[PDB]
């Protein structure tokens, strides 16, 4: 519902999988702008 007091967001940082990058959470819609809409297919590996 709310960011921790005195913070504006949460950084979720994987501590086991060293190859995994971060995720982030915000609690106010005005703190993001959807700048690019990307339309795509996943590709089957050969």
């Amino acid at each position: 519902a709310h960011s921790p007091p005195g913070h504006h967001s949460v950084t979720g940082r994987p501590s086991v999988n060293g190859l995994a990058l971060a995720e982030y959470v915000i609690y106010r819609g005005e703190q993001a702008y959807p700048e690019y809409l990307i339309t795509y297919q996943i590709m089957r590996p050969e």
Partner: protein, 162 residues
């Protein structure tokens, strides 16, 4: 108020956005269960999202956060994938619709790995996969992510057990 401007494949902007998509793919611990089995994407279209009202709302908040954080918005470009993407581009993000508890609680989630955001395009855990074939690894159906400008400000550091 939203217009979508199609970018051409030789536009430098098309190319830098695609490279961010492609280069941030990883393997996932579910073996592709949620989002499917792939090492790369086939980018079909990139549109720039233009809405004056949502942009002004954004920059107003950015300035507030920045003044609360030694003039540092801590602005990132990050992926968002969910079934809410069509609503989001027209209405902007809305925290009221973002009430499900994830790994880091309720709220609006973004990812550095495009492949993480790809896990959610059809729902939590990939839901039942694509609407046409019910296939979470569908290689036919078109998918959509947003590449978003996100103000983090002072971000609380949560180490996760993943």
């Amino acid at each position: 108020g939203t217009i979508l401007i199609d970018l051409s494949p030789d536009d430098k902007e098309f190319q830098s956005v695609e490279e961010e998509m492609q280069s941030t793919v990883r393997e996932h611990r579910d073996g592709g269960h949620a989002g499917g089995i792939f090492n790369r994407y086939n980018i079909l279209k990139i549109q720039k999202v233009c809405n004056k009202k949502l942009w002004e709302r954004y920059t107003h908040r950015r300035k507030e956060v920045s003044e609360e954080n030694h003039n540092h918005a801590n602005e990132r470009m990050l992926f968002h994938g969910s079934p809410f993407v069509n609503a989001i581009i027209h209405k902007g993000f809305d925290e009221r619709h973002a009430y499900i508890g994830g790994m880091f609680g309720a709220g609006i989630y973004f990812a550095e790995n495009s492949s993480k955001s790809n896990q959610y395009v059809y729902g939590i855990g990939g839901g039942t996969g694509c609407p046409v074939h019910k296939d979470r690894s569908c290689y036919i159906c078109h998918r959509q992510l947003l590449f978003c400008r996100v103000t983090l400000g002072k971000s609380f550091l949560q180490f996760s057990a993943m």
